[PDB]
Amino acid sequence: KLRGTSHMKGEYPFTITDHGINIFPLGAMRLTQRSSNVRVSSGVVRLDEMCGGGFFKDSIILATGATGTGKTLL
Amino acid sequence: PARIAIDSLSALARGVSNNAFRQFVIGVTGYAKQEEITGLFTNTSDQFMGAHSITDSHIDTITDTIILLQYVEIRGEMSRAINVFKMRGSWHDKAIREFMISDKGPDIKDSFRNFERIISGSPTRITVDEKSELSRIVRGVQEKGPES
Amino acid sequence: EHQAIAKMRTMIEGFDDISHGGLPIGRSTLVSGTSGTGKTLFSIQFLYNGIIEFDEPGVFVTFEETPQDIIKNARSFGWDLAKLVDEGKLFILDASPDPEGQEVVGGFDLSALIERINYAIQKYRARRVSIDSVTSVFQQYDASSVVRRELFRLVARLKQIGATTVMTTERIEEYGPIARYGVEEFVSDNVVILRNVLEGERRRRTLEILKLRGTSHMKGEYPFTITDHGINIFPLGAMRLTQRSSNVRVSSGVVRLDEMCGGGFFKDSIILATGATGTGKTLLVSRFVENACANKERAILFAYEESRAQLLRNAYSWGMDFEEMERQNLLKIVCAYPESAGLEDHLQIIKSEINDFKPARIAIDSLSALARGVSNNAFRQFVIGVTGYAKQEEITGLFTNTSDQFMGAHSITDSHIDTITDTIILLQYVEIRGEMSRAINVFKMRGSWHDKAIREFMISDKGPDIKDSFRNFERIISGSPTRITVDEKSELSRIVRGVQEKGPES
Amino acid sequence: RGEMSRAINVFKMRGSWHDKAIREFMISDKGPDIKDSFRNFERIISGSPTRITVDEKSE
Ligand SMILES: Nc1ncnc2c1ncn2[C@@H]1O[C@H](COP(=O)(O)OP(=O)(O)OP(=O)(O)O)[C@@H](O)[C@H]1O
Ligand SMILES: Nc1ncnc2c1ncn2[C@@H]1O[C@H](COP(=O)(O)OP(=O)(O)OP(=O)(O)O)[C@@H](O)[C@H]1O
Ligand SMILES: Nc1ncnc2c1ncn2[C@@H]1O[C@H](COP(=O)(O)OP(=O)(O)OP(=O)(O)O)[C@@H](O)[C@H]1O
Ligand SMILES: [Mg+2]
Ligand SMILES: [Mg+2]
Ligand SMILES: [Mg+2]
Ligand SMILES: [Mg+2]
Ligand SMILES: [Mg+2]
Ligand SMILES: [Mg+2]
């Protein structure tokens, strides 16, 4: 509590390092990430063609599959 | 870095609770999203073939583009296959392709067109009279055209 | 009203509903809870409101906080108790001990205090009274039996005086005893309990009325939030089922669909769009929000999966420029991580934003996003909320739900919200010849007729294209169909040879 | 054919190339005698296969 004002409610994980306390407001970060129309290769030209030209520079790419399928390669 | 990659988020979700994982993901995800860093995350589905869900941990939603690898039982042999399941900004291919791994790398060949139930890993080969119709012996209407 | 007890209005949002009218007049209500639970706000706000809406001067007794501080803090929400104390509408009565004190004084002071309070009320002609943390008073050196007697006295003098008091109290455990000494619970006329349940790192505050000696009220815990406006409770169970229903129609942003929908969605309906990840629920919503703007209506989009930036890249790639939509002051996008608050909070942020903008169309992209980690009973209860609000407000709704398993989903929703929604538009993948193809289906419409066809649809730069169904297919829902042909080649436009042209001319 | 026959397979080899076939294999006083694959079966992995015996192309 902070009699008199507002704040963020809940627990928050922080880490004691060589630079003291470091708290990560994993709920404070805002949904204002920058997004463009740029492309980038992958290391696989054909894959680049299937994806439509290439992975966007601004994005997250996920690679699923059973053990041994070859994500580590990609 | 301009590009970051984490091999097996599936490794990090070992033991740790779900909610605590999803939190980590959102974390390493958004920091890379706002900082202009392209990132490739690796997930290993606990069960080869027959996997009914993209990720056991249900992260698939917090992602932009999904690339999927999955074994396909073909004639007593375990072959790979790849699919750009989804991409938010682009068009991307909808063909579940085959692919070999060599000393050179990943060669993405064709799709399994003559099959059914591919996603289940153990597909059903099904040509038995390919698209040329029972008229491969074209009936016999064409018996008038050539003469003397 | 049929209630043997005449109640007084707190004017705190929804408390009155929960208490079926507000506090009983001439009695005392124990409002207790742990630390930072809302006690002092409630009390303060209880006096305030009686002052601003009924000109009912009030007396506020403090045992720990300083009279300067109760004023200082009270500005946080935007009230000037100062001025009120100036007009003599609010007398603050300081009973905090001193920074340079002694030891011993809690019985003849309880008598002196009663005699004190009687005065202030007599002098200010007050009708409302608060007593903050009586607990801290016996917190000098006492035991159960001495408290009960000393409370009883105060309460009894208060009721003889005819005052409608409110006493705050502390507890240690969120679910254990109600009060500290475990005696306040039985000497009060009414008991209001405030909790700040931790549970999974987040924090949820609820308000409960255990008892009102004399009347009915709303049983159980009810969520509430503290904001720049004070306390705010949501009677998620008091929300009656008497929402208006019309036969009007509204586009879906996509024509073919509309057809499929008997003629465009109902103005008064909750719309559910399920399907595997990547099926294009997001797309559809974008069109649904767009169309309202193309017709000059206001609509909000609450996105819990995509950034406001990305939401625009993709929206443009699908044609439809959201930029303008923001400019013409017709579309308003929100964006919020579900982990950036609890359900009680998100529910209100939505409502609020729904008021400051008066949408006609609302679209929450990914309810299954909000379902992350929450207990189903807590989620279902959220859904009912947003949904309900939207229904009783004539605001069409388009909700989105993503299924945990692509292809092979034996259920519309994993949270079984199915029956809350009025219309359902389904999306899924179809492994047709080594290829993942999209298929759209209008599963159910409550008031219309809607097509019963599982049409294939392809996504393009222009957007959604609704073709035809895989008639010659069995096990379609299986995700990976089987193809049986009694025909196919059948008419439609046989005539072989050279049927086409090419890019040159036709 | 109503018999519990074994099969071996190198599922994944990180460095090497390893064979991809699912090979039949028996056991005797000599040890493991790996045989041929089930080239003409479907759903081996599942355990309860299904011979294809495709009518070739049927001429
Ligand atoms: N030099 C190579 N030549 C042919 N095939 C190879 C070669 N190296 C690896 N492979 C094949 O690729 C697979 C290796 O998988 P990969 O390293 O891509 O990562 P993964 O499947 O995502 O994760 P993990 O390595 O833990 O299994 C092997 O199962 C094997 O069949
Ligand atoms: N403007 C505000 N907006 C949002 N929250 C606020 C605001 N002002 C105060 N709060 C919150 O309200 C709480 C204040 O509690 P309050 O002073 O009403 O009584 P209490 O915690 O029940 O008892 P005590 O006075 O002993 O702490 C704090 O926990 C704080 O986080
Ligand atoms: N410009 C485009 N052209 C062709 N297809 C596109 C285009 N944009 C997106 N798509 C397709 O639509 C999908 C994007 O999904 P969409 O944003 O519509 O929401 P969703 O699938 O319902 O939910 P989520 O995006 O959270 O997975 C991609 O996977 C892709 O196949
Ligand atoms: Mg692996
Ligand atoms: Mg690996
Ligand atoms: Mg998604
Ligand atoms: Mg306190
Ligand atoms: Mg207090
Ligand atoms: Mg989405």
Numbering used by the authors:
A (entry chain A): 224 to 297
B (entry chain A): 372 to 519
C (entry chain F): 14 to 519
D (entry chain B): 446 to 504
Give the text the authors published on this PDB structure.
The circadian clock of the cyanobacterium Synechococcus elongatus can be reconstituted in vitro by three proteins, KaiA, KaiB and KaiC. Homo-hexameric KaiC displays kinase, phosphatase and ATPase activities; KaiA enhances KaiC phosphorylation and KaiB antagonizes KaiA. The crystal structure of KaiC from S. elongatus revealed a hexamer in the shape of a double doughnut with approximate dimensions 100×100 Å, whereby the N-terminal CI and C-terminal CII halves of subunits are joined by a 15-amino acid linker. Two phosphorylation sites (P-sites), T432 and S431 that are both located in the CII half were identified in KaiC.
